[PDB]
Symmetry: C3
């Protein structure tokens, strides 16, 4: 397309919503290509990530860790307004792994506090893709301070299985997994600081050990459990988008499966089926589709079970419906 051709396309303004929910969208594209417009404000803020009151200086797209999920269709244009308010202290930018050129947009979006920028790119490849900050010289520090999220580029015709059959989800949830590296003093207590830049040197020391102190979903231990559990019902088709911008993960739904999994995240590669545990490399997003067949509590975990149960990488689904005894039954309940 020429610049004139693009200027004649319809514009659509999208309101973002906080993870794990996803803004409203249509699976099959309603019409031809659009310029889809989003706006995000960056907030630097302290977050508390566990029940011991441990703090991280988060650098958050839209004020959440992860940043929100943006949804477009193949061959739409994504137009982002990115704002770094004067209340912040650091320069920031954005690299979309879905985009082609200029370091995924990082080289065109460097904004100091009090600045804004607008970037547009054509979403030429369908799939789920990571986005993250990447300021020169400080790339990994922004990413492991929570400045990352994902976008989904749906095929215009919606999702399909390997053999061209349509896959239509009832519910979608976005789980962003974050490794954090919090410094400790000589008594093994986590340190606190009064500004992000003050934590920089101590944090780099921990990062170089390659071992996170916490690995969490949606920005904190227990964020998606108990009463902030994701919900579904028996018979509902659910798409679970999962991203990790820095470190590998191996998601598993305890009690379920991934019926179709795009473990690479890319919808032109056919999905793996019937998976117990799938693998998403650091720097990628993946998606799993599952139809719930049994009610009750499911845990959704990174299946390095130390990372899930000791370091924080565990969420719940609460699923309503009737029990199927053909699939599973207690023949003799625990007894003497």
């Amino acid at each position: 397309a020429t610049a004139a051709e693009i200027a004649a396309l319809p514009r659509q303004k999208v309101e973002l919503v906080d993870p794990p929910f996803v803004h409203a969208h249509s699976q099959v594209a309603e019409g031809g290509p659009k310029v889809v417009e989003f706006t995000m404000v960056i907030e630097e803020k302290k977050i508390v990530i566990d029940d011991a009151g441990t703090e991280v200086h988060a650098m958050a797209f839209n004020g959440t860790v992860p940043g929100p999920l943006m949804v477009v269709h193949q061959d739409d244009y994504l137009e982002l307004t990115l704002i770094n308010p004067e209340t912040n202290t650091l320069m920031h930018n954005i690299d979309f792994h879905a985009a082609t050129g200029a370091l995924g947009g990082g080289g065109l979006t460097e904004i100091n506090p009090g600045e804004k920028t607008i970037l547009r790119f054509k979403a030429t490849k369908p799939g789920v893709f990571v986005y993250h900050c990447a300021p020169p010289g400080m790339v990994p520090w922004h990413v492991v301070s929570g400045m990352n999220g994902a976008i989904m580029v749906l095929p215009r015709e919606g999702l399909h299985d390997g053999k061209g059959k349509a896959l239509t989800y009832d519910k979608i949830y976005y789980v962003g997994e974050q490794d954090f590296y919090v410094p400790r003093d000589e008594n093994g207590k986590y340190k606190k600081y009064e500004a992000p830049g003050d934590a920089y040197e101590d944090t780099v020391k921990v990062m170089r050990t390659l071992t996170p102190t916490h690995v969490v979903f949606n920005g904190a231990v227990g964020a998606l459990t108990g009463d902030k559990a994701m919900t579904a019902a028996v018979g509902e088709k659910v798409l679970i988008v999962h991203s990790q911008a820095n470190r590998d993960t191996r998601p598993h739904l305890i009690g379920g499966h991934g019926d179709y999994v795009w473990a690479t995240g890319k919808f032109n590669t056919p999905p793996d089926v019937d998976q117990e545990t799938w693998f998403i490399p650091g720097g990628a997003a993946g998606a799993a589709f599952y139809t719930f067949q049994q009610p009750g509590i499911y845990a959704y975990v990174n299946h390095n079970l130390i990372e899930a149960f000791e370091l924080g990488a565990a969420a719940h689904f609460k699923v309503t419906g009737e029990w199927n005894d053909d699939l599973m039954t207690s023949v003799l309940a625990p007894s003497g």
Copy 2:
């Protein structure tokens, strides 16, 4: 589907065998869906994992680490009697990744010492799958103390390649890989404890470093080497099932390949072919098929070669038969310049 129709099905009681061997089974299912019955008793026991005498309090399904492989076919019912003897000290349960609902069985099978339970589930999805203990609040500690194994759900028509050609193995071995986290004293010497409970706090400290002290096949360093090496012959088709319930691994057969590898472990996903090194993420099982074409010793390793040769994750195959010089030959043996 009905309670009635299920009690009408034939029952077959299987006697389990210790890894790396697998109980007798047929690849192609003979006749219709069955209720296949297994019994395992849980043992808490001290095991020695290296030649230095390092001890771990293991928590072992059927007394072995890994637990034994169970084989059924798709749409069979697996019925497990699980027994926690009153000589044990902890509650245990089982989560089958092959099963659907109730945390894979784990929410229905919590048994204290002196208790037993019977669980039945329909094996709806073909593949190899991990099982493991998962008691609320102590999940990784029972897994990394050895409490895990695998099952294989064969398609009823047996295995096939990506394009419908039948693949029939002559023999099957199950390699369970285990990461252990053994606490050290001030001299760097491994510690010993009286009961499993006593080791808990020090072991969680090592677990949180995410760095195992030992990574082993079949429960110990060198367990599947020497007189305990797996065996085959030139021309023999072997299926190697490998599981890791907690940590990634990257198996490789030194001197061979994986001719067809279901690296995800699931037989409706077509296999990768001609693999050098394949990758099984923590919490999964995979399977590789190979036809041996050369005699001699092979080593089967996790190809982080520090984990293989320093931490324990190496086994041997001894293969009989004739050498093929077309595939490889020494044109000039090591000689002076």
Copy 3:
């Protein structure tokens, strides 16, 4: 083939070139199977691997880390002459993951200083494959001292996609990634040693932490950046071969994609498509094919970004050509 047939095949002697470049070869084979002859000399030498003057005693096929890429076609025979000069101190050998039997050749090629050997094997399976040294009882120590490389066995009809369409590259580069484990003294300074054997105990202690001190491409921090960036032009098709003999990696082209990725490295397994980040397990090689669409500087990284930008695993591509504003454009440049 008969014995006389094998004995009658044409021989071709190939001069190797240092990575990241590759010796001249044809994609589509020209004529029937051949015996392709290569000679490599092993060098044990001290190399400097970062900007701080940190030394390692490298053990280097042909004098380089990684060793060079050898290219043959399926069902050719590769015949290697391997020489261990009298000035080295250790026995060495070679295991080709491409070969069948005798531990990949390792059992037949153990040469002490002052010895040579000639090994021939038939390249029966197409793909990229790791090769590395593996002397009994000292395998990891030779591998993590740099003694590894890769070979490519191309299909006789050249590369194709999943749907049997030909893929022809214009340029090929080989990126070998190396994890090093360099000991430190109690002051945190890296140690130096007179002879390789003097470093053995201290190095195995670091190896057993599973945490590298440096993760590099082509043997050193920054080896493929600046004036040594890899080059291409918009519209050129590049094949990037990447190996890691001991530890996993997750390559990503910042600003691009892998249009076709043989992540397993084996050309009978259909490629994944449209990849953002792909995953190569330790002990394997992989290959990614990309057509460049935008000019500029791209970084090619291991996307554990701590490993890329703190520990050394980052390279650059410099790509010439005209900017395409359809794919990406700055609608509003950073402004107050």
